[PDB]
Amino acid sequence: GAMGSMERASLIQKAKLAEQAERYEDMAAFMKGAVEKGEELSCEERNLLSVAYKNVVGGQRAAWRVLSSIEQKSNEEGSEEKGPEVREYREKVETELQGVCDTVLGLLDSHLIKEAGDAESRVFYLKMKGDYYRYLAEVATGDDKKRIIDSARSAYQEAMDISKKEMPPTNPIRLGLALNFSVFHYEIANSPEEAISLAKTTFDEAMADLHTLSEDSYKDSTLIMQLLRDNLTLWT
């Protein structure tokens, strides 16, 4: 790999520089190189990995949705035929997005998840696995769509089981996992009631644990609680 000759610490340093410069493709490539050094990642390093790929795939998802909307309109009644170009270019972006998801899932499988023993790392990586299978599910249309959906569900469920056993209800990783699994239920699994129930129960349990927290921890937890509330307001 092109990062094989660079020191692990230099890759991390450059990932932080790329973030400051909003160069997220570079940031992702640097953190991929750091993961491939084979050492476990610290808390800060895990969040650099997540930030980088979340931004890259976020831009690809936004573009895919623009192009998919155009393609769907072109297939309505009374829409003039414009040839294969819209489909081709949507497919190009889709393939690039799938490739990024496959890359992340490959890093998790070789070998981040199997070496992750602490709840904070294991839940973080399993949430990531659920997230990137969810992104694959958003564009899936063929024979393997059900298996992609179930792979997302399975990863989220394992993360949830650990998080409920090992973390307090206000833990930001636990909260963000529940937020995203709730979105999975609503957007992917056609289960809006499950989505709503999960978001409400997560919010209420966290509310009841806020009294245990410092001011700084209270700020971190309430930030994600507000995202659960935003979704509940959208959905009810």
Partner: peptide, 6 residues
């Protein structure tokens, strides 16, 4: 309109 994830 936007569904929130993190």
């Amino acid at each position: 309109g936007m569904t929130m994830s993190v």
